[PDB]
Design a binder for these strands. Structure first.
Lengths: 119, 52, 48, 52, 125, 147, 186, 51
RNA sequence: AGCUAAAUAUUGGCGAGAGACCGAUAGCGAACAAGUAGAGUGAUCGAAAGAUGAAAAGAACUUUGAAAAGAGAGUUAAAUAGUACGUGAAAUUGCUGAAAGGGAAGCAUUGGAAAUCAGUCUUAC
RNA sequence: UUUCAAUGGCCCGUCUUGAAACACGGACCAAGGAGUCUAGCAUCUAUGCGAGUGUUUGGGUGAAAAACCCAUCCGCGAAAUGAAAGUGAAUGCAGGUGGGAACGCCCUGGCGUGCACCAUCGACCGACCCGGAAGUUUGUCAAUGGAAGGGUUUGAGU
RNA sequence: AGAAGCUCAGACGAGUAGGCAGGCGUGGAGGUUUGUGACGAAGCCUUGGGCGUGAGCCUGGGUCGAACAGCCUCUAGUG
RNA sequence: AAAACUUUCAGCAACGGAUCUCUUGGCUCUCGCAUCGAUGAAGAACGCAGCGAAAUGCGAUACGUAAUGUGAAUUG
């Protein structure tokens, strides 16, 4: 079923997919890499995590297989407002067991957002 | 251009019904709704059913 | 079958629930829907 | 349920219409590939992108 | 959305009807809203403009200017307002036309037909 | 449509895929089936033999309805029955034998291709083959002619 | 300059199904992994037949499967039947034996009869769990040349193939070149 | 001049057939017209059955 | 010997609603004063041609000139909108700057000369 | 980018064995400008269903030329063959044989097993050439009827 | 690891008529992008820059004044 | 051999009217309706306004009279 979703949305129309002439960018509000791919596909992965920026505050999102039918409680929010290091250990801790290799990607994403926040 | 060009086109009724059932099934998947462009990030459940 | 909740006019959950209809377990076929939609969207055209 | 019926019981509002059957029983191919039934017999995986 | 099939949604037809309207039809096409005092006094939102009425310009470069309607110049869909004029190069003065929808009526030139019109349009006097 | 066709790929190519030496001319070989005995004879003889000349005798004012006689074989006689009737009678010894009126099924003759189960059966029909009847009687049933 | 017969020679093969079916592609993706991670000729042939087209995948029938699995020696026992194609019912056989078939599609009559009378209907992915190497599976094919086109292919002098004729009768390619009374028979 | 596989062509199109092409773009309109006339007859003929 | 409603037709007339139609060399010949101007003894033949601006506010006045106009000024959001009026392409033309050239020119390749210009860098650790 | 020097470079399109051609067309620019649609057919491909299939001639239903739903017919397919009258497809596990996909067993082969497809030998159905057993009633002596069986003929068959 | 992806190796590369494949461009239709726009859309001019083997595409500056585009599909009076 | 001249490139200015945007027009489809004339029709000719050539309208009651409706214009 998760593969059905990817075969429907990945290669064709998707509101978070931005195809230009040779490449795919994924702006989806719950992705980390920024690119379109099942491994990183937020909608087609039932267990997946992300970080995004908001008003000087970092946010980590997670979602599971249990709450798929209820979009309202489907995604889970946590807020971060501390320095980078501690913000790193939070993602490390929150993901040392959950995604598999998203730990490094969201460390990279948290990196870029904190440079945004200082600027 | 002529008026007797073929404007209307035939689909087998069984294949029309196949597509209708497939679209209803697609409406029951939250991921497809978000992908198509619906702002359902806050709705309680899919399918969203309200009282009579 | 999985059950779905029913919501009142005020957005609260009602006790009554419905089982998921079998139509939601039907195959999802974007290619066939696109082909049928391609044809059906030609059936209200006017000649020119 | 009356409008579309099931895949084995006919719809009431559509005569001799049955919900279509899929060609694949379970579409979770990744978990079916990674299941123990497959990985218990597949020969030892060759390397990924190989050294030249 | 419109559900009647006696009315047309065509841009071609609606523009043709507007710009080919006779003088009597243009009379209703040139309608202006009433001021708040008149609205609460007559229970009327809008009336067609008539000569000799008192109005205030609500939009444009002449916003806020007041004056009596000297001529509702129907064939151009314009209102000519007293002292709303322009100084030409030669020294003469040319009137500046204001559309009826851009003015607000602050005093009506009441006739017995206008009173009948007001009470016929769900109002009182 | 039009965008996935040729003449969208020959835009730029002279002669539009019809060649230079010979070109696209209106009717260089004749219109329609012109020929068949003079210069189309090679195609007509090798791919459509029997096309020229008469065979047989004419029938004036032919009407299909008196000739209407669709045929059914023995291996479909039991499928002509409803499922409940097959369940009740197929393979079960009963004093009362099931009856199939193939005329109401749309058939004017019962042919003998295929096998027939051993349960007795009454076949109501207009026409029947010789050995179609032999297998029906062999299966313990009878054939009754209908008109 | 090199004296090579032909350059850049692709032979004939299909590398993916021309079908845009999402579920067929899911099955192909499964059997791509199975074919290249096992030494099973079964998995390779299933992958190839998933690539094949509709005319190259004829329908097989319930009775044909019963006929092939009940051939004297046979030893077909409870071995699952696998066909890459559609399984159609055969009304002519009045009792369906207990059979196990894995196929892309079962017609509604065929699936009902198989389940009602004995065995089970499986999809090709469920077969991949029970017999991931295709052990004790009877792989079968439909009659490729039962198609109407082959009734015409190869028409010519003394080939006994069906001509392309708009109607059947005494007036339609029956006189000259078809009998000795009108010139010749060819 | 006929060299391809298939049956020999039989198109009866040697007259001025475009002059007499009949289109069915008024099929939905006629269906609604027949419905309205049938309902007009139903209301007009009183209790008496329409057939 | 004879009559007869309905279902059927309808490039015309009349009244409407539309459109995956055309967009001023297109769409009817004609979006405009179009079957008009013009042609032909006649039967007939038959065009071209839409766009200042929100508003004429269409340039008062001074000055040069026989005048047409120019130059100032003025109107305007704009006169790089002045009716020879939205935008204003190419062919082709004048002016200016640069360059080239002993009976063609153009091109390709490689570098020089002259003009022109971006990247990179400066930093980060 | 411009220009210079060195080297190279004929005018493109076109029919043609052969074009720089003393062969044709081309002074220039902008805009327009040529494998379309329809009734069929054939191969191939995709989809639905599948011994069936096709709702849209209509009727129902929608205030709406859409979508949805629907009775009875009918088209094509499920049987062929012959000019017709007519007849009309299992001796067998719906046969043998050869090669064969996949599988199983054994120590690379071997052994089974054989889908699909061809080569081939038959069996069956219709015509064609014989052969006339019953049986039907009318002519019984006959009239009509066609069985078994034989040909190595044929069909766009099973 | 847009598995339609990634990776390794070897051989090879002329072409009229012609066949096939993948792409570029144009008008209109459905969906989509919190899409661009009078703080300048479209168009046009350009000894500016950038990308692609190419069809082309983007951009700086100038002019201009009202609409237009990316992506997925549909279509054609499409170069 | 400098200028002129010729050609090229660029800027500005001409010539020209492409392009873009628009559109009371056309085209096609559908729906509905049935109504010319010797009681003078369709068509034609000449006239009619304070200032009009055409178009539009009308007929010596001549850009119209009566009647009905609206309700204060027409406009150069």
């Amino acid at each position: 079923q998760d593969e059905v979703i990817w075969q429907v949305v990945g290669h064709e129309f998707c509101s978070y997919r931005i195809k230009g002439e040779a490449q795919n960018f994924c702006r989806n509000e719950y992705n980390v890499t920024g690119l379109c791919n099942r491994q990183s596909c937020p909608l087609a992965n039932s267990r997946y995590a992300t970080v995004r920026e908001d008003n000087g505050k970092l946010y980590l999102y997670m979602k599971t297989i249990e709450r798929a039918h209820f979009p309202s409680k489907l995604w889970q929010r946590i807020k971060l407002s501390k320095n980078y290091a501690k913000a790193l250990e939070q993602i490390d801790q929150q993901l040392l067991y959950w995604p598999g290799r998203q730990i490094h990607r969201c460390k990279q994403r948290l990196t870029r957002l904190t440079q945004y926040l200082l600027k | 251009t002529k008026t007797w060009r073929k404007w209307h086109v035939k689909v087998n009724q069984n294949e029309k019904r196949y597509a209708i059932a497939s679209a209803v099934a697609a409406s029951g998947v939250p991921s497809l709704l978000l992908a198509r462009g619906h702002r359902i990030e806050e709705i309680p459940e899919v399918p969203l059913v309200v009282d009579d | 079958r999985p059950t779905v909740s029913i919501y009142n006019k005020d957005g609260s959950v009602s006790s009554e629930t419905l089982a998921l209809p079998f139509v939601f377990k039907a195959p999802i076929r974007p290619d066939l829907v696109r082909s049928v939609h391609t044809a059906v969207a030609k059936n209200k055209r006017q000649p020119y | 349920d009356s409008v579309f019926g099931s895949t084995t019981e006919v719809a009431q509002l559509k005569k001799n219409y049955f919900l279509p059957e899929n060609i694949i029983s379970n579409a979770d191919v990744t978990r079916l590939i990674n299941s123990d039934e497959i990985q218990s017999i597949v020969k030892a995986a060759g390397p990924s992108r190989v050294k030249r | 959305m419109k559900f009647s099939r006696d009315v047309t949604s065509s841009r071609r037809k609606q523009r043709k009807a507007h710009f080919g309207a006779p003088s009597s039809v243009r009379r209703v096409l040139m309608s202006a809203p009433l001021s708040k005092e008149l609205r609460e006094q007559y229970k009327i939102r809008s009336l067609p403009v008539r000569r000799d009425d008192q109005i205030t310009v609500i939009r444009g470069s002449n916003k806020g200017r007041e004056g009596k309607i000297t001529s509702v110049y129907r064939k151009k869909f314009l209102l000519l307002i007293e002292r709303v004029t322009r100084e030409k190069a030669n020294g003469a003065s040319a009137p500046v036309g204001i559309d009826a929808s851009k003015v607000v009526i602050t005093k009506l030139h009441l006739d017995k037909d206008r009173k009948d019109l007001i009470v016929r349009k769900g109002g009182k006097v | 449509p039009t965008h996935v066709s040729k003449t969208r790929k020959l835009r730029g190519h002279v002669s539009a895929g019809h060649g230079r030496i010979g070109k696209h001319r209106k009717h260089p070989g004749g219109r329609g089936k012109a020929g068949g005995l003079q210069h189309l004879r090679s195609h007509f003889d090798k791919y459509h033999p029997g096309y020229f000349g008469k065979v047989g005798m004419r029938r004036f004012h032919l009407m299909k309805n008196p000739l209407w006689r669709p045929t059914v074989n023995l291996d479909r006689l039991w499928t002509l029955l409803p499922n409940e009737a097959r369940d009740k009678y197929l393979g079960k010894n009963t004093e009362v034998a099931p009856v199939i009126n193939v005329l109401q099924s749309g058939y004017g003759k019962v042919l003998g291709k295929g096998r027939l189960p051993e349960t007795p059966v009454i076949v109501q029909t207009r026409y029947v083959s010789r050995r179609a009847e032999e297998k029906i009687k062999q299966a313990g049933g009878v054939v009754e002619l209908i008109a | 300059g090199i004296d090579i017969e032909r350059h850049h020679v692709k032979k004939s093969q299909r590398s993916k199904p021309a079908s845009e079916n999402v579920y067929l592609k899911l099955l192909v993706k499964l059997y791509r992994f199975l074919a290249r991670r096992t030494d099973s000729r079964f998995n390779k042939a299933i992958l190839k037949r998933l690539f094949q087209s509709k005319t190259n995948r004829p329908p097989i029938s319930i009775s044909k499967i019963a006929a092939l699995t009940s051939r004297k020696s046979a030893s077909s026992q409870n071995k699952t039947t696998v066909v890459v194609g559609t399984v159609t019912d055969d009304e002519r056989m009045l009792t369906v034996p207990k059979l196990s078939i894995a196929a892309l599609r079962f017609t509604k009559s065929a699936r009902a009869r198989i389940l009602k009378a004995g065995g089970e209907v499986l999809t090709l992915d469920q077969l991949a769990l029970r017999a991931p190497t295709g052990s004790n599976t009877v792989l079968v094919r439909g009659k490729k040349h039962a198609r109407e086109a082959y009734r015409h292919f190869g028409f010519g002098p003394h080939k006994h193939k069906a001509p392309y004729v708009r109607s059947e009768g005494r007036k339609f390619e029956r006189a000259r070149g078809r009998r000795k009374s009108r010139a010749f028979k060819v | 001049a006929i060299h391809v596989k298939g049956q020999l062509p039989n198109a009866h199109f040697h007259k001025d057939w475009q002059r007499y092409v009949k289109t069915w773009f008024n099929q939905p309109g006629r269906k609604l017209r027949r419905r309205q006339a049938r309902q007009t007859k139903a209301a007009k003929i009183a209790p008496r059955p329409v057939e």
